[PDB]
Design a protein around this ligand. Structure first.
Ligand SMILES: *[C@@H]1O[C@H](CO)[C@@H](O[C@@H]2O[C@H](CO)[C@@H](O)[C@H](O)[C@H]2NC(C)=O)[C@H](O[C@@H]2O[C@@H](C)[C@@H](O)[C@@H](O)[C@@H]2O)[C@H]1NC(C)=O
Lengths: 499, 219, 9
């Protein structure tokens, strides 16, 4: 039980963004602005509920139409939250309402907390090809948004979950790339290769979940949870990779990912975090100190389903070695996009690839979390060490050392909230790696420090001396404390006698 | 006259501006190329109107044979025409600055394009904006320290009012007078927002890439 | 060209 900076929203928090010492929370019907220091609410923006109407088009406020004959009230579930610093500093928010439209919140010159003064809706009426909706960005069933400045333009890599729900003039794409017009008035697709969608025949039978998305070495990566095959009854985790070109999705290849236990397959990814390795771990897995490593939290599947079994494993995939496997040549055509029997498959940028063999790694915690469901992960370096901030389905938060050779006891281990921990994380590194972590639990956000959570929790001399050096713990006759707080003076970090 | 202004067409629609620097060579930007298929592209010369309405007696439609991409840093691309353009009173070539060259701050420049205007009913006739060269120190200060400027970049901004290039103007020129001669000093590339009052435009410095340009054009 | 004039200016 700890007294840490905390904030409780009226509605559940979906997204979190940090910009210029402020915490931006993408929650249901609200965007909250919090102070970085004490998590105190500085401002709020009401994004909902929104009154939906087929006649009242996106981005236009139908407040008068509340007294209708065909209008419905819908909750604005925040699907995406982004800070654009390339153009005039602004916050981009995309919600489930108004066919997944986005809106930019322009910050006044010296007031980051002001998210009310200048709000522009990103929607332009289509005249060239009304069959396409580039401003219809986000899906309500699930959406992952990754933005990046590419070729002097802000690009939006959007992964959307889809079902057979047909929408005329305003449809949604599975994996796509669109750029903001320099006028800031709307998005636009460049070619027909700017999107890769599931065939109408498999839209409901083949669901796709976009768990994580990142940009590394000019490549765009998407982490997916989808069926092993179109006709398969079991689920899979796939890594999606494509060329970071504005013009479209080039060199699109998808290979499976597996987290094995010495053979036990943790086929379903719950959360992912990309970061550099610690000196010890770098050497352990054959990686440089400047190498990007995909840290994936995986879980065993309920037979023939996608829901997890409360059995987890975590293994590291260095992006260098990930690319090595993509370059290595066996290979199948993209079955959800192309016909499973069409001419493109009977051949061999233009063509879409699907790998048959999975890239696999052994659980770095060596079956330590094989009895719990891990729902959150964020990695960080402290000296030679690599530490993982772990979230559980029970609401447990923990900090534990990551090492290829043997698991460790978590230094921090406590019940944060009754609600599971959100995969939406933030790690801040302030001068000499002594920063914090922003952890979500339902409608609560907590600021946990990176240098541990005290010392007085270690019951025995064994647990006290097993603690990493940055915690600066030591045994003082009967209590685990810091050097400066040892009454008697019998303070050691080396010897445990029969106490 | 402005006979060097090229209009790059993608799928029979104007996508970008360009500068005719040699009879078979057009200097444009990489952002103008969505497709890798050079059949979908066409170059229009000797036009004042975007749709080439009142200039059929001057219009020189040409196909694109090669695409030569500039060094990694530059957003430049040298475009080879399948046939050399015939020079007359309506079609001419623009001069390039020498490799180790510069122009001082306050040098009067012009940007040309058939791009976005903001106007309700735009006629489609070629437009100009009068900008003035700004030094890379004042430019970074005017940009509120959001971007550090390389040697490969050139700054120019209009006086007090909000004016400059936008969507559809990319690849086009920043024409300035050097040594009693009109030269292409920059190339229109996507900026950090269109025509913001007191915000100068960042263009790719042609003088910096002049050595690479003469390597490709001289054949 | 935003805030521009016809080419002959
Ligand atoms: C929906 O709200 C409207 C107001 O925003 C109502 O109309 C407005 O009602 C006012 C009285 O409450 C009246 O002074 C306004 O002139 C009127 N505005 C317009 C443009 O009609 C509307 O229905 C009205 O209210 C009821 C009580 C009756 O007076 C009707 O004749 C009005 O149209 C509201 N409808 C419902 C279903 O509540």
């Amino acid at each position: 039980k700890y007294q840490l900076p905390n904030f409780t929203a009226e509605t559940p928090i979906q997204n979190v963004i940090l910009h210029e010492h402020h915490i931006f929370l993408g929650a249901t019907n609200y965007i909250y602005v919090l102070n970085e220091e004490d998590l105190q609410k500085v401002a709020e923006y009401k994004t909902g509920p929104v009154l939906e109407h087929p006649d009242c088009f996106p981005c236009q406020d139908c407040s008068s139409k509340a007294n209708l004959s065909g209008g419905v009230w819908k909750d604005n579930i925040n699907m995406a939250l982004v800070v654009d610093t390339y153009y005039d500093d602004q916050l981009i928010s995309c919600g489930s309402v108004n066919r997944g439209t986005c809106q930019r919140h322009v910050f006044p010159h010296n007031h980051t907390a002001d998210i009310q003064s200048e709000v522009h809706c990103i929607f332009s009426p289509q005249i060239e090809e009304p069959s396409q909706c580039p401003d219809c960005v986000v899906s309500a069933l699930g959406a992952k948004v990754l933005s990046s400045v590419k070729d002097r333009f802000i690009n939006f890599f959007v992964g959307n979950t889809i079902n057979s729900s047909y929408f005329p003039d305003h449809p949604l794409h599975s994996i796509s790339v669109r750029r903001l017009k320099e006028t800031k008035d709307g998005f636009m697709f460049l070619t027909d290769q700017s999107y890769i969608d599931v065939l109408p025949e498999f839209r409901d039978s083949y669901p796709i979940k976009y768990v994580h998305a990142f940009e590394s070495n000019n490549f765009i990566y998407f982490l997916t949870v989808q069926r092993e095959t179109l006709d398969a009854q079991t689920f899979h985790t796939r890594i999606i990779r494509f060329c970071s070109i504005n013009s479209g999705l080039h060199s699109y290849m998808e290979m499976p990912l597996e987290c094995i236990l010495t053979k036990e397959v943790f086929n379903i990814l719950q959360a992912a975090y990309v970061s550099k390795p610690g000196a010890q771990l770098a050497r352990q897995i054959g990686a440089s100190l400047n190498d990007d490593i995909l840290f994936g939290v995986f879980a065993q599947s309920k037979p023939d389903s996608a829901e997890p079994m409360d059995r987890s494993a975590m293994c590291a995939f260095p992006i260098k070695y990930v690319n090595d496997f993509f370059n290595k040549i066996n290979v199948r055509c993209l079955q959800h996009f192309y016909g499973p029997n069409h001419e493109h498959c009977f051949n061999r940028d233009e063509y879409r690839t699907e790998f048959t063999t999975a890239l696999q790694r052994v659980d770095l915690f060596m079956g330590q979390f094989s009895e719990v469901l891990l729902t959150s992960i964020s990695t960080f370096i402290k000296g030679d060490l690599t530490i993982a901030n772990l979230g559980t389905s029970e609401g447990r938060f923990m900090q534990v050392v990551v090492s290829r050779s043997g698991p460790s006891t978590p230094h921090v281990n406590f019940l944060l909230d009754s609600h599971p921990v959100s995969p939406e994380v933030i790690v801040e590194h302030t001068l000499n790696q002594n920063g914090y972590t922003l952890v979500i639990t339902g409608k609560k956000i907590t600021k946990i420090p990176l240098n541990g959570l005290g010392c007085r929790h270690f019951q025995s001399c064994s647990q006290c001396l097993s603690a990493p050096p940055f915690v600066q713990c030591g045994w003082c006759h009967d209590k685990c404390v810091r050097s400066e707080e040892c009454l008697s003076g019998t303070w050691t970090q080396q010897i445990c006698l029969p106490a | 006259n402005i006979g060097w202004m090229v209009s790059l067409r993608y799928r029979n629609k104007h996508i970008c501006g360009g500068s005719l620097i040699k009879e078979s060579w057009v200097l444009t930007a990489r952002q103008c190329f969505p497709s890798r298929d050079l059949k979908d592209y066409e170059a229009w010369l000797g036009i004042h109107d975007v749709h080439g309405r009142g200039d059929e007696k001057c219009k020189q439609v040409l196909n694109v044979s090669q695409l030569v991409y500039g060094p990694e840093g530059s957003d430049l691309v040298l475009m080879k025409l399948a046939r050399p353009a015939v020079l007359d009173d309506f079609v001419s070539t623009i001069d390039l600055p020498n490799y180790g060259s510069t122009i001082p701050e306050k040098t009067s420049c012009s940007v040309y394009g058939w791009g976005y205007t903001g106007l309700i009913n735009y006629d489609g006739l070629l437009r100009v904006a009068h900008l003035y060269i700004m030094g890379n120190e004042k430019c970074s200060q005017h940009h509120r320290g959001k971007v550090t400027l390389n040697e490969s970049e050139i700054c120019a901004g209009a006086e007090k009012i909000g004016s400059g290039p936008c969507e559809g103007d990319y690849g086009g020129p920043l024409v300035c007078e050097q040594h009693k001669m009109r030269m292409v000093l920059g190339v229109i590339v996507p900026g950090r927002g269109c025509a913001i009052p007191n915000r100068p435009g960042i263009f790719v410095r042609v003088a910096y890439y002049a050595k690479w340009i003469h390597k490709i054009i001289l054949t | 060209i935003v805030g521009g004039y016809p080419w002959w200016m």
